[PDB]
């Protein structure tokens, strides 16, 4: 029963809790929990990246899970809009997330 959740954390400890089912879509989470496991035990503290950015980055992972569950491409899956303002920092969050 491996937690069922991992914690991607933003700025001053704003913790987004991501279901294992989504988490595993990031090989990076899967590595981190196993490598420096004394530390990153389903915890990724990007304690500098902002919650509204991290939210979109992890929402992509959830969206990916939904898309996968859907399987047949689109069953009311919305357009994954990313405002320009997001992209700037979201790039780094996305890189760390590294699907």
């Amino acid at each position: 029963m491996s937690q069922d959740f991992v914690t991607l954390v933003s700025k001053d400890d704003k913790e987004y809790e991501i279901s294992r089912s989504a988490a595993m879509i990031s090989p990076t989470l899967k590595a981190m929990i196993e490598g420096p496991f004394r530390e990153s035990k389903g915890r990724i503290e990007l304690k500098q990246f902002d919650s509204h950015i991290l939210e979109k980055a992890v929402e992509y992972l959830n969206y990916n899970l939904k898309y996968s569950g859907v399987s047949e491409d689109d069953d009311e899956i919305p357009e994954f809009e990313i405002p320009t303002e997001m992209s700037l920092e979201l790039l780094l969050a996305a890189d760390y997330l590294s699907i």
């Binding site: 980055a57 992509y60 990916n64 994954f80 990313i82 405002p83 320009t84 997001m86 992209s87 979201l90 790039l91 996305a94 890189d95 997330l97 699907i99």
Partner: peptide, 15 residues
Amino acid sequence: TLKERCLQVVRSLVK
């Protein structure tokens, strides 16, 4: 995917 979207947005912004 996310990277591609982000890159496309950045590219669009720069263009």
